[PDB]
Design an enzyme around this catalytic site. Structure first.
Site, PDB file in Angstrom:
ATOM      1  N   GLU A 153      -5.444 -13.064   5.881  1.00  0.00           N
ATOM      2  CA  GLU A 153      -4.254 -12.271   5.581  1.00  0.00           C
ATOM      3  C   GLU A 153      -3.747 -11.448   6.761  1.00  0.00           C
ATOM      4  O   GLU A 153      -2.553 -11.168   6.848  1.00  0.00           O
ATOM      5  CB  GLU A 153      -4.489 -11.368   4.361  1.00  0.00           C
ATOM      6  CG  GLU A 153      -5.410 -10.187   4.580  1.00  0.00           C
ATOM      7  CD  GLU A 153      -5.782  -9.515   3.270  1.00  0.00           C
ATOM      8  OE1 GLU A 153      -6.397 -10.191   2.415  1.00  0.00           O
ATOM      9  OE2 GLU A 153      -5.456  -8.322   3.099  1.00  0.00           O
ATOM     10  N   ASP A 191     -13.047  -8.640  -2.433  1.00  0.00           N
ATOM     11  CA  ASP A 191     -12.218  -8.460  -1.248  1.00  0.00           C
ATOM     12  C   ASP A 191     -12.891  -7.333  -0.471  1.00  0.00           C
ATOM     13  O   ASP A 191     -13.139  -6.259  -1.023  1.00  0.00           O
ATOM     14  CB  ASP A 191     -10.791  -8.072  -1.636  1.00  0.00           C
ATOM     15  CG  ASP A 191      -9.841  -8.129  -0.462  1.00  0.00           C
ATOM     16  OD1 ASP A 191      -9.951  -7.268   0.439  1.00  0.00           O
ATOM     17  OD2 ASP A 191      -8.995  -9.046  -0.434  1.00  0.00           O
ATOM     18  N   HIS A 225       0.763  -1.246   0.000  1.00  0.00           N
ATOM     19  CA  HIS A 225       0.000   0.000   0.000  1.00  0.00           C
ATOM     20  C   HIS A 225       0.796   1.300   0.000  1.00  0.00           C
ATOM     21  O   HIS A 225       0.203   2.384   0.029  1.00  0.00           O
ATOM     22  CB  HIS A 225      -0.964   0.018   1.189  1.00  0.00           C
ATOM     23  CG  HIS A 225      -1.810  -1.210   1.295  1.00  0.00           C
ATOM     24  ND1 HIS A 225      -1.614  -2.166   2.270  1.00  0.00           N
ATOM     25  CD2 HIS A 225      -2.835  -1.653   0.532  1.00  0.00           C
ATOM     26  CE1 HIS A 225      -2.483  -3.147   2.100  1.00  0.00           C
ATOM     27  NE2 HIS A 225      -3.235  -2.861   1.052  1.00  0.00           N
ATOM     28  N   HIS A 280      -1.839 -14.702   0.737  1.00  0.00           N
ATOM     29  CA  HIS A 280      -2.065 -13.346   0.264  1.00  0.00           C
ATOM     30  C   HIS A 280      -0.752 -12.833  -0.342  1.00  0.00           C
ATOM     31  O   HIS A 280       0.282 -12.832   0.331  1.00  0.00           O
ATOM     32  CB  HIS A 280      -2.480 -12.461   1.442  1.00  0.00           C
ATOM     33  CG  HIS A 280      -2.320 -10.994   1.188  1.00  0.00           C
ATOM     34  ND1 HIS A 280      -1.089 -10.376   1.143  1.00  0.00           N
ATOM     35  CD2 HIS A 280      -3.235 -10.025   0.962  1.00  0.00           C
ATOM     36  CE1 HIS A 280      -1.253  -9.088   0.903  1.00  0.00           C
ATOM     37  NE2 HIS A 280      -2.548  -8.848   0.788  1.00  0.00           N
ATOM     38  N   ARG A 294      -7.278   5.231   1.573  1.00  0.00           N
ATOM     39  CA  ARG A 294      -6.779   4.461   2.702  1.00  0.00           C
ATOM     40  C   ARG A 294      -5.475   5.116   3.145  1.00  0.00           C
ATOM     41  O   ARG A 294      -5.118   5.074   4.321  1.00  0.00           O
ATOM     42  CB  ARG A 294      -6.542   2.996   2.307  1.00  0.00           C
ATOM     43  CG  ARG A 294      -7.831   2.265   1.955  1.00  0.00           C
ATOM     44  CD  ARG A 294      -7.663   0.751   1.968  1.00  0.00           C
ATOM     45  NE  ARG A 294      -6.943   0.242   0.806  1.00  0.00           N
ATOM     46  CZ  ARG A 294      -6.804  -1.052   0.535  1.00  0.00           C
ATOM     47  NH1 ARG A 294      -7.333  -1.960   1.349  1.00  0.00           N
ATOM     48  NH2 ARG A 294      -6.166  -1.443  -0.562  1.00  0.00           N
ATOM     49  N   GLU A 344      -2.354 -15.985  -5.630  1.00  0.00           N
ATOM     50  CA  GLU A 344      -2.750 -14.609  -5.887  1.00  0.00           C
ATOM     51  C   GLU A 344      -1.622 -13.717  -6.387  1.00  0.00           C
ATOM     52  O   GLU A 344      -0.472 -13.833  -5.957  1.00  0.00           O
ATOM     53  CB  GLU A 344      -3.325 -13.967  -4.616  1.00  0.00           C
ATOM     54  CG  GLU A 344      -3.522 -12.451  -4.751  1.00  0.00           C
ATOM     55  CD  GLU A 344      -4.039 -11.771  -3.492  1.00  0.00           C
ATOM     56  OE1 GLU A 344      -3.558 -12.093  -2.381  1.00  0.00           O
ATOM     57  OE2 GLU A 344      -4.920 -10.891  -3.622  1.00  0.00           O
ATOM     58  N   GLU A 375     -14.157 -12.278   0.463  1.00  0.00           N
ATOM     59  CA  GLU A 375     -13.016 -12.256   1.373  1.00  0.00           C
ATOM     60  C   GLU A 375     -12.895 -11.200   2.467  1.00  0.00           C
ATOM     61  O   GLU A 375     -13.192 -10.021   2.266  1.00  0.00           O
ATOM     62  CB  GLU A 375     -11.745 -12.252   0.510  1.00  0.00           C
ATOM     63  CG  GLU A 375     -10.444 -11.911   1.211  1.00  0.00           C
ATOM     64  CD  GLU A 375      -9.245 -12.127   0.302  1.00  0.00           C
ATOM     65  OE1 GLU A 375      -8.150 -11.628   0.619  1.00  0.00           O
ATOM     66  OE2 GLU A 375      -9.399 -12.809  -0.735  1.00  0.00           O
ATOM     67  N   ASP A 390      -0.490 -14.178   4.832  1.00  0.00           N
ATOM     68  CA  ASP A 390       0.528 -13.534   4.012  1.00  0.00           C
ATOM     69  C   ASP A 390       1.796 -14.143   4.607  1.00  0.00           C
ATOM     70  O   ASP A 390       1.981 -14.117   5.827  1.00  0.00           O
ATOM     71  CB  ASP A 390       0.548 -12.018   4.212  1.00  0.00           C
ATOM     72  CG  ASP A 390       1.630 -11.340   3.378  1.00  0.00           C
ATOM     73  OD1 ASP A 390       1.301 -10.724   2.340  1.00  0.00           O
ATOM     74  OD2 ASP A 390       2.814 -11.436   3.756  1.00  0.00           O
TER      75      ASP A 390
HETATM   76 MG   LIG Z   1      -7.623  -9.679   0.935  1.00  0.00          MG
END
Ligand SMILES: [Mg+2]
Ligand SMILES: [Mg+2]
Lengths: 405, 405
Positions: B280, B226, B33, B329, B59, B349, B252, B302
Site C-alpha cells: 500500500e 494489518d 486517516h 488497498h 496516530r 478491501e 500485512e 492503493d
Molecule cells: Mg494495510
C-alpha cells in the site's frame, strides 16, 4: 569531574524559501538547478524527459526548477540559532511548520538522533523514502547539527571525531574539465547530452566529447560522465565501453533510482576497471543498503537529500564495511564537515554553479554567507574551523515565509 | 468504416484540498486517516512511532492526518470534466498547479499514458518513487481516466476490457470482524495494537484478539492482521506463528517499504499456508517488481498512491505473470472499476470509515457524491454502470484552492 556544559532546549523552528515556481526563478541557493539562462547545467542535458522534443533542450522546461530553496532555522532558548538549506521550497515549509515542528520544539539541542528518528517514523506514510519529503527532513537534521555545533562552539567536523586528512581534494562537475584542470581540480565530470533515443549517434557524440577532453587534460586528470537517470542498461553498457579507450573513471547514475536490478546488471557489464556509481537521488539508510548490494563502486548521497548528516554518517559506515567509497553529491559545507572525517571519502565533488564553468562561484551562491570554495582545487581543514557548518544565512535574499505555527 | 468519435482537448486542470493541517481536521474524504475522535482507526494502532510514549495511543498525534485530501479536476474544451481524490492536500495542489499542469493542458483527453509518463519523468528528481508526490501523480491519472470515460460515455471498467466477475466480494478492515460478518463481508482484517517494544506481551495480546474473533466468526470467515509498517522480522515471525493456530489468512505490511530483504526473509519464515502481504505504501511499477521478487503473496497498491490506474493495471499484470494476486488497498470506485476486470483480484478491501465499524459509511465519505458501498458485502457490476468512475464531486465540502496558474 567538572559539571558538564549546560545546553539550552530548542524554542522555535522556522522555514523559508526562495526561488521555485512561487518565487523568483533563478534564485540559485539550495536548488542547484534554479538557474538563469545560458547555464551549462541546462544545456541539452540527457534526462528521462529528453526523449520528448519539447523537453530535450532544457531541463528547466520540464520543471527541474519548480521547488527552489528550502531554508530551515532552529532557535534555542538562549537565542542561538542554527540553519541549513536544501531543495524543497514552499512545500518543504509546509512539512516543517505544519508537521515536523512537533518533534523539534522543546527538545534539547543535543537530541539530534531522536528528532531524526521521529521525523522518519512520522512521515514514513508519505515520504516515499526519498525526494521532496526526505530533502525536508535532511534540511532539518542539518539545521540541528548546525545549532548544536554553534551552541557547543565547535565545527561539526570536530564533533564527529575530527579530520582524517588535512585538506579535501575536489573534482569539478561541469562542461569544462579543461578549465577545471587549470583551477587545480583533480578531475572533471561532464554531463551526457544524448540518450537511448539517439542510439549509436548519441553514443558517438558523448564519447567524442570525452575523447576531446582526454586530449586536452592529459592521462592523470580524471574524467567522468554523469547520466542523470537518462539511460537503460544496454545504452549505458554501450556508452561505457565506447569510453573505455579514454579511461573514463566512472559512469554515474545511468538509471532511475528504483532500478537496483538494472544497476547490478550494468556493473556486471562494465569495462574492466571502470566504476559505476549512483545514489544522489536515493534516500534512507535502507535504500542505500539495497543500492550497495547491487555491487556499484561508489554511492553518492546528497547530504541535503539522503536524510541528512545523521544518515550520511551511517551510509559512510555501510560503504566502509564493504571496503567501498562514499562520495557525496555537491552539498558544500554540509558534505565538507562530514567527509573530511571519512577515511573512505578520498575526494569530493564541486558542482559548477558558474554558468560557463569558468569561475569558482560558491556551491550554494548566494544563500550562504562566507561559503568556502576550493582554492587550487582544495579546501584545507583550517577553512572549516568555525562553529557548526561555519556559515551564516544571507538574509538579503528575499526569503518568504509561507507558513507559521 | 464510420468516422471515429471526435474527442476534445484538455483545457484546464485545477486542484483543491479539504482537511489537513491548513484546513478543517477530520474532513475525511480522500485521507482515510483525517478523522475525528473516538475512531477505531486511531485507537492505539501499532506504528513505527508507537514505541514513543507520546505517540503510542494516537496516530493523529504524530501527524498521520496533516496532508488531508487532494482533489484534481480536469476540464475538456467541450466543458466536460473528470476528477479524482487522494491524500496530499495543499502540497498536492502546488505540484499540480505549479508543475504537472504543463504536461496536462492542451493534450487530447485520450493522451492518458503519455501524460502519465511525462509526470513520472518530470518529477523523478523529487518524487522518491512513492508517497506524497506519487499520490499527486496518481490523483491526476485517475482524474484523466474519469474525464476520458465521461467524454466517451462508458464506465472505466468497460474501457479496460470488461468485468471478469458479476460482483466484487469484500473483506472489511476495522476493529469489528464480527459485525462485518453480519454485514455480509467475507472476512475481517484487524490492526495490531502492540509492537516489538511490547515483546511477548504484545504478541499474546494481539494473538488473543485474533483468537477471540475466530471464536465469534467461525472457521470460514477470513481473519487477517494489518501491522502498518510497525514491526521487524523477528517480531513479525513470532506474531505470525502465534496466530497460526487460528488460521490467520495473512499478516500485512509488517515492515517499512524499503525493507525488501526483510520481506523476503519474513516470507521464508512464515507458517505454512499463511500469506505475507504489503504494497500500500509502495509506488512505481519498478518498486513493485522488486517487491514481487521478495516472494510475498499479495501486493496491495492503493490506486491513488501507487501511481494511478495506469500503474495499477501494470502491477496486476506483473502479479498475474507470477501466478499471484493483487488486492488493492481501499480506493473505492478507483479500485472497483479496475479490479472487477482483473482475473487475479478475487476479492477487494473495504476500509471502515465508520468510527465504530458498525455501519457502511462510504469509503471516501463525504467528498464523493453517490459513492457506492457494499450491499451484503458485495458490489454488483451494474452498480458501476455509470460514466468514468461513476461519481460526482461534493462541492458542499469547503474546498480550498491554494494555487492558480
Ligand atoms: Mg494495510
Ligand atoms: Mg550526478
Amino acid at each position: 569531574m567538572e559539571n558538564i556544559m549546560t545546553l539550552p532546549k530548542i524554542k522555535h523552528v522556522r522555514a523559508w524559501f526562495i526561488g521555485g515556481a512561487t518565487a523568483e526563478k533563478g534564485a540559485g541557493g539550495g536548488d542547484y538547478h534554479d538557474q538563469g539562462g545560458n547555464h551549462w547545467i541546462d544545456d541539452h542535458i540527457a534526462t528521462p524527459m529528453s526523449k520528448y522534443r519539447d523537453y530535450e533542450q532544457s531541463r528547466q522546461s520540464f520543471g527541474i526548477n519548480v521547488l527552489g530553496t528550502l531554508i530551515v532555522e532552529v532557535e534555542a532558548e538562549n537565542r542561538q540559532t542554527g540553519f541549513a538549506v536544501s531543495t524543497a521550497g514552499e512545500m518543504g515549509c509546509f512539512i516543517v511548520e505544519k508537521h515536523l515542528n512537533r518533534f523539534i520544539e522543546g527538545k534539547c539541542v543535543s537530541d539530534i538522533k531522536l528528532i531524526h528518528d521521529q521525523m522518519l517514523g512520522a512521515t514514513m506514510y508519505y515520504s516515499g523514502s526519498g525526494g521532496l519529503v526526505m530533502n525536508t527532513i535532511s534540511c532539518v537534521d542539518l539545521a540541528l547539527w548546525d545549532l548544536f555545533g554553534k551552541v557547543v562552539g565547535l565545527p561539526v567536523y570536530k564533533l564527529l571525531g575530527g579530520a582524517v586528512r588535512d585538506e579535501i581534494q575536489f573534482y569539478a562537475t561541469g562542461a569544462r574539465p579543461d578549465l577545471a584542470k587549470e583551477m587545480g581540480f583533480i578531475g572533471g565530470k561532464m554531463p551526457t547530452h544524448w540518450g537511448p533515443h539517439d542510439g549509436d549517434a548519441g553514443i558517438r557524440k558523448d564519447a567524442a566529447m570525452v575523447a576531446d577532453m582526454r586530449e586536452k587534460c592529459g592521462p592523470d586528470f580524471w574524467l567522468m560522465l554523469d547520466c542523470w537517470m537518462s539511460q537503460d542498461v544496454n545504452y549505458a553498457t554501450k556508452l561505457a565501453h565506447a569510453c573505455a579507450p579514454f579511461n573514463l573513471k566512472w559512469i554515474e547514475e545511468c538509471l532511475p533510482p528504483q532500478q537496483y536490478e538494472g544497476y547490478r546488471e550494468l556493473k556486471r557489464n562494465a569495462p574492466a576497471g571502470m566504476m559505476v556509481t549512483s545514489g544522489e537521488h536515493h534516500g534512507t539508510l535502507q535504500s542505500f543498503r539495497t543500492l550497495a548490494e547491487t555491487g556499484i563502486d561508489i554511492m553518492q548521497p546528497d547530504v541535503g537529500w539522503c536524510g541528512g548528516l545523521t544518515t550520511l554518517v551511517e551510509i559512510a559506515a555501510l560503504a566502509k564495511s564493504r571496503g567501498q567509497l562514499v562520495v557525496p553529491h555537491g552539498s558544500s559545507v554540509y558534505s565538507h564537515h562530514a567527509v573530511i572525517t571519512f577515511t573512505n571519502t578520498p575526494f569530493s565533488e564541486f558542482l559548477m554553479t558558474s554558468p560557463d564553468c569558468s569561475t569558482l562561484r560558491p556551491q550554494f551562491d548566494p544563500i550562504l554567507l562566507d561559503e568556502p570554495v576550493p582554492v587550487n582545487g582544495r579546501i584545507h581543514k583550517s577553512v572549516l574551523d568555525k562553529p557548526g557548518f561555519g556559515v551564516e544565512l544571507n538574509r538579503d535574499c528575499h526569503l518568504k515565509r509561507p507558513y507559521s505555527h
